[PDB]
RNA sequence: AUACUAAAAUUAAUAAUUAUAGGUUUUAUAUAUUAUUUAUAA
RNA sequence: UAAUGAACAAAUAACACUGAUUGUAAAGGUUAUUGAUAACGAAUAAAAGUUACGCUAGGGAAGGGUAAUAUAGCGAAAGAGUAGAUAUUGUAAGCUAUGUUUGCCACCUUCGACUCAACAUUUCCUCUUGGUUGUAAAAGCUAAGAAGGGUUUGACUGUUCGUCAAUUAAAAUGUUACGUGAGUUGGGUUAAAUACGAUGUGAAUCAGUAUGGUUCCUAUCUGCUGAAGGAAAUAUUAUCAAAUUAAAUCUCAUUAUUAGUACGCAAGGACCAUAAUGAAUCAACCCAUGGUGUAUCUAUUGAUAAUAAUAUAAUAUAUUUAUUAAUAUAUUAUCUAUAUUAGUUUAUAUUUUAAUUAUUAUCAUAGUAGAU
RNA sequence: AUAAUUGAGGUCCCGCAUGAAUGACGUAAUGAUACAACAACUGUCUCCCCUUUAAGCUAAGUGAAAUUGAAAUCGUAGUGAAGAUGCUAUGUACCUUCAGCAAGACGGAAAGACCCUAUGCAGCUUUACUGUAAUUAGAUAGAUCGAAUUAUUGUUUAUUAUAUAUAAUGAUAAUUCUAAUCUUAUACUUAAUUCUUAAGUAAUAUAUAAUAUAUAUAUAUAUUAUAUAUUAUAAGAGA
RNA sequence: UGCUGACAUGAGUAACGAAAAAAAGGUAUAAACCUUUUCACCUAAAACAUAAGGUUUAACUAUAAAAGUACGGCCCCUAAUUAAAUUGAAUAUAAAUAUAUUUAAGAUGGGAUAAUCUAUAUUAAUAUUUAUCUUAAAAUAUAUAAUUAUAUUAUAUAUUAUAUAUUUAUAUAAUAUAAACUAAUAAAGAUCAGGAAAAUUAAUGUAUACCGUAAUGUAGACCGACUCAGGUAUGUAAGUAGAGAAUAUGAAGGUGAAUUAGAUAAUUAAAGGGAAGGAACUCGGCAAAGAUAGCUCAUAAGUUAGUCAAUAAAGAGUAAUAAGAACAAAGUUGUACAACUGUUUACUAAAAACACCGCACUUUGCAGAAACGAUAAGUUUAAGUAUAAGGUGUGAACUCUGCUCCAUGCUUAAUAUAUAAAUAAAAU
RNA sequence: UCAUCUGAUUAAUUGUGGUUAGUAGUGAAAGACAAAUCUGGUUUGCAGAUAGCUGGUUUUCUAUGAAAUAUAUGUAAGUA
RNA sequence: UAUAUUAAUAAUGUUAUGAAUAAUUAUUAAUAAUAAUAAACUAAGUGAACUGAAACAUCU
């Protein structure tokens, strides 16, 4: 079909295929580009596939040695996400991947 | 297409947006409730 | 003959003559098998 | 005789006129002068466009008149016409007629196609006739009488028009609200959408271009096409009916004869008249031919229903036999129920008696084809 | 290309008045877009004919609508606010209808259609006029809301150069400090079950004075005493 | 074109709104109501169950029967969202009120037990959508532990015979059609990456609340002025035949209408056929006609390589050689415009206009740009961070995008430079 | 309404709720829609807005009885 | 569960194991709450436009 003549996306065979950890992902509310007044403050923004905003660490205060288990794809971020597992505490987390 | 069928009934919506409590629980709603009462209207609200 | 009208044909059943429509009979048309056959007897 | 400008608000000086408790002052007043509202009796110190997306209150604050123009004629004849202005042609000027074109006034606010046409003659063809050193014949030119009949089919274009092709005797000119939208169409023209070229700062605009784009009416009166009833009938009824009134029709071509004659060196080729074939229009008819033919018959796919005969079972009535069994008749029915792993359908086995033939019928566009 | 083409395709270029993201040009596919050509097909047409159903017509029941100054509502010519059922002249016409037609009654109603007027309305445009949100800038010559250092330069006083320096007073730019501003995150006891005040002391934090120790008057640690606290802490901007 | 009331003309005219009816009897009262028979229409509905709605219109006043186990509401829990509610002084604001946090409300959603019928209370302790492919093996047919081909890949419960606590349950072994279809785990492909919220034991306890329930619900019972050919959500929707919920019949059910009875003039609408021509019609093939498989093969040029072209046109295989239901199925080419699928003027314009993926420019460093906020707090941007977000133009892709910043802006550097406000002091 | 035609796994259709609207929302952009049609809805009030414009203004008798010119006017439909 | 809660009592049943203890019946003290409530007049805040000026903005 003519709509596939320009469909082009990178293929990373190492990206995870399973669902992310539920304990971190939270529901992403759709505002439709409308502020609390109801009016459309930001235009050209509308409905789309339902998504869950992932919680990605951007501080990394705790520190210590950590190992990544799976590199996943975040629907709400242009960048990938890495699921870290602490080598001592075992706590899990998501961080912007390099 | 054909028109005239603009009023599609529904008790829930009709009562929720034109009912007595739909007006007794708001400043503007109360004002029109008392205006109808002063005029002597029998049917204050839905 | 005709939109409704109008025109035209008959309304006989008697001592004698008259058929308007339906039905019936006869002939014919159409349809389509039939001589390898239809009705009869000897 | 032209050489000009009101008030208002300000400015300058003079007068001694008021001086908001009194004295001054401030401010006003009288007198003289100053500056431009040129849309020139000057609406503000200060203001341009677009609208087809538009809205409200009002006014009209193709017919008619005219005939410059256009068409046509008449008078006179400069000049062509081998000769001669008047066979034919007729510069420029003159006198007219029509209101068929382009105009002008403002009394008065849809072009083309389809269908049907009615009227005029300023006659395209057909009929009669005059002139034609330019009528030898035949074809022709010009003109007079003549409106009875006739006056096209395609390609292109929205076109009327026009170019072209093929025919005809001819493919005439107009009027009728440039006939005909309460008769049809609606391609152009225009309103909302859009784009191109040009104009504009733009919003938008165009004697521009292109695609798309809403009209309706059951006829009261007049008129017309047909059909009735009442009636007054030189006084009835049945029938036959003349004069009269209204209207229809009135034709045209090709060939043949006269005759290859008349005429003409030759080429070419008659008038007058007659007949036969047709064209166009109208009327009537269904014997025959083609169409139709929800009369009818035959063929055929799928599904369903029904009648009769046969087999089975039950009920009822008569007969035989011994309430059993059988014959005759009549009526009724060809079911049902379980298993095959949850549900439905089917198939088979199991239970009961749960049949085959024959001829119909309905539905599928008249189901469909062939006939009629 | 057709018998014949103002239409279509190719080509030529005095392009009235094309042209490169108001994009330029050539394709494949797509398109209920517009125009044109070929094959088949047909009642579109020559040229209309027959048939079926629902109306139309008749009888019974029920029963609207736009319209309507009053009508006893004919033709022709002329006249006329200029196209006459109604005026003038003349002609024709016995009275009343039914099914049709749609030439007139400038037929009827929505609603047409264009102009002109109004010192009428509304939308849109702009370097029309007049405001204004918004944005920008100044007011130690306003407030909230203060200072220090460094560098350049302006003007002047005593002293000098000639027929250039010191100092004062400002301005400009940068840097730094802050309880100026601003942002971000998170125990006992008396006196009036719980609350509050109050003398004393417990423990934490801050500041000052004294004593002792260790290094090069200064730094660091410990003890004693006095004063305060039981909205703060951390980060950032900062006169 | 005055307001209201009454009555006229049009006029006993148009019309009575998709349609099959007929006889006998209720009833010597019936076209219209009831019953019986015949005929017909709807039948993946005009049937059967429902939701919402509604003058209860129903088979009616003597009237619509619930502890729950497929019965819904009610009740617990929340989404979008709402709130004169809550927080010397939550923040902001001429009032109205707005913002942020809590709390409460809010189904279109989630909520254990159950025919071998089940027990909800009190106290105490601690899951987006989507498919079941290939190999294997068993079993089967022709052939000889080898090979070809073939239904099946997993569950759904009955019978027979055995072992366990002892005729109640489990387990074992054998038997038992095909095509659809249902809920549950299984396995696994893509990016468009897929809701929120409310524990177990031990003892005790249950006398089962209130409301909905008729009929109509593809319509005479709702929204449309009407007993209006319009609008209205869900599940079955017999069989025969088919790929199919297409199309044909129709078992059962319902149904055949506030208009009837005659001839069917001219004329109108919807259909059937039509000789000889076959677009001559017409602005323009508008309309109508045209189908030699529906399965299996085959299928060109061009081309962005995509059976795009393409369901290619013509053609072939299967009984058809004169035909006999319905539905699906209607050619080729050139040019202009647009890349394409899509959106648009409810009710005259569906297009060449909008959008589009793509290209390009530009603003914003997050205490940000953009927007809203009588105006602020604040909100969307975003729980995002220059490969992101906002604005602008062009608009897939091949070959390309030449020139100039004069004018309007934008942007950088210059105390080159006038001017407003604000102030002291000092001369007339 | 009928015939014909288009999409029919998607930028799809649809049920039940909720938010955004009158200087004002939504809008794949048409001056489209906001309860039978918006270049900005409806209701109430200012309000008997204003109208140099249109229409209307009702019994009788009697006597007199014009003008449509000039000037000025953002004035030629008005007025002095 | 205001026919309510706590406490006390008399009895019953009654667990617990005479007394206690709650459950119940019945008395007494304490513990608690019901906003439809007018219109006009007055004062205060904000504050238009149509209109007149025969236009219009100062003005109204
Ligand atoms: Mg955007
Ligand atoms: Mg209504
Ligand atoms: Mg609502
Ligand atoms: Mg007799
Ligand atoms: Mg006879
Ligand atoms: Mg006889
Ligand atoms: Mg007879
Ligand atoms: Mg003045
Ligand atoms: Mg004096
Ligand atoms: Mg004084
Ligand atoms: Mg003075
Ligand atoms: Mg002016
Ligand atoms: Mg236009
Ligand atoms: Mg004239
Ligand atoms: Mg001469
Ligand atoms: Mg002359
Ligand atoms: Mg003559
Ligand atoms: Mg001659
Ligand atoms: Mg004669
Ligand atoms: Mg005409
Ligand atoms: Mg004419
Ligand atoms: Mg242009
Ligand atoms: Mg079209
Ligand atoms: Mg006679
Ligand atoms: Mg004669
Ligand atoms: Mg004739
Ligand atoms: Mg015949
Ligand atoms: Mg015959
Ligand atoms: Mg014949
Ligand atoms: Mg015949
Ligand atoms: Mg049927
Ligand atoms: Mg040509
Ligand atoms: Mg043509
Ligand atoms: Mg060309
Ligand atoms: Mg450009
Ligand atoms: Mg192409
Ligand atoms: Mg009648
Ligand atoms: Mg006349
Ligand atoms: Mg007369
Ligand atoms: Mg007429
Ligand atoms: Mg008629
Ligand atoms: Mg004027
Ligand atoms: Mg009156
Ligand atoms: Mg009539
Ligand atoms: Mg009639
Ligand atoms: Mg009738
Ligand atoms: Mg009867
Ligand atoms: Mg069907
Ligand atoms: Mg079926
Ligand atoms: Mg039902
Ligand atoms: Mg709740
Ligand atoms: Mg629910
Ligand atoms: Mg019900
Ligand atoms: Mg029921
Ligand atoms: Mg209906
Ligand atoms: Mg209703
Ligand atoms: Mg049946
Ligand atoms: Mg029913
Ligand atoms: Mg009916
Ligand atoms: Mg034919
Ligand atoms: Mg033929
Ligand atoms: Mg033609
Ligand atoms: Mg023609
Ligand atoms: Mg067609
Ligand atoms: Mg190829
Ligand atoms: Mg088809
Ligand atoms: Mg080209
Ligand atoms: Mg397109
Ligand atoms: Mg499309
Ligand atoms: Mg439209
Ligand atoms: Mg359309
Ligand atoms: Mg994009
Ligand atoms: Mg901003
Ligand atoms: Mg961007
Ligand atoms: Mg564009
Ligand atoms: Mg491109
Ligand atoms: Mg383009
Ligand atoms: Mg360029
Ligand atoms: Mg100054
Ligand atoms: Mg398609
Ligand atoms: Mg399709
Ligand atoms: Mg898909
Ligand atoms: Mg426009
Ligand atoms: Mg309305
Ligand atoms: Mg609109
Ligand atoms: Mg007023
Ligand atoms: Mg008024
Ligand atoms: Mg007098
Ligand atoms: Mg006079
Ligand atoms: Mg003036
Ligand atoms: Mg005047
Ligand atoms: Mg005037
Ligand atoms: Mg005024």
CA–CA separation, B16 and A60 (whole Å) = 50
Closest CA to A75 of A33, A32, A28, A43: A28
Tell me the C-alpha distance between A50 and A30, whole Å. 9
* DSSP class per residue in A46-83: ---S--EE---BS---S-S-EEEEEEEE-TT-SSEEEE
Q: What is the DSSP letter of B40?
A: T
Instruction: Name residues whose C-beta falls within 8 Å of residue B46's C-beta, 6 or more positions apart in sequence.
Output: B14, B15, B18, B19, B20, B22
Resolution in A: 3.2
Containing H/E element for B11?
helix B11-18
Residue with tokens 């409308």: A34
- What SS3 state is found at B13? helix
Q: Stated in angstroms, how far is A25 CA from F277 C1'?
A: 82
Between CA A48 and CA A56, with CA A51 as vertex, the angle to 5 degrees is: 135
Q: Using a 7 Å CB cut-off, which residues contact strand G?
A: A 34, 37-40, 43, 46; B 3-4, 6-8, 10, 12-13, 16-17
For A29 and F197, how far is CA from C1' in angstroms? 16
Q: What is the DSSP letter of A95?
A: E
> Under DSSP, is residue A92 helix (H, G, I), strand (E, B) or coil?
strand
Which phi and psi (to 5°) does residue A38 adopt? 100, -25
Residue A78 burial (10 A CB sphere; 0-12, 13-18, 19+)? exposed
Largest CA distance in chain A: 53
Token duo for residue B37: 């009462």
A48 touches strand F (CB under 7 A): yes
Give the closest residue to A84 by CA, choosing from A70, A63, A98, A74: A70
């Amino acid at each position: 079909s003519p709509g596939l003549r320009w469909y082009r996306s990178p293929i990373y065979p190492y990206l995870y295929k399973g669902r992310p950890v539920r304990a971190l992902t939270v529901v992403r509310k759709k505002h439709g580009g409308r502020n609390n007044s109801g009016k459309i403050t930001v235009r050209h923004q509308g409905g789309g596939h339902r998504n869950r905003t992932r919680l990605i660490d951007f501080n990394r205060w705790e520190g210590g040695a950590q190992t990544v288990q799976r590199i996943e794809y975040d629907p709400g971020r242009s960048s990938h996400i890495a699921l870290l597992k602490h080598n001592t505490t075992g706590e899990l987390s998501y961080i912007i991947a390099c | 297409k054909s028109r005239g069928n603009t009023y599609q009934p529904s008790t829930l919506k009709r009562k929720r947006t034109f009912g007595f409590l739909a007006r007794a629980k708001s400043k503007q709603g109360s004002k029109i409730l008392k205006r109808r009462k002063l005029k002597g209207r029998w049917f204050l609200s839905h």
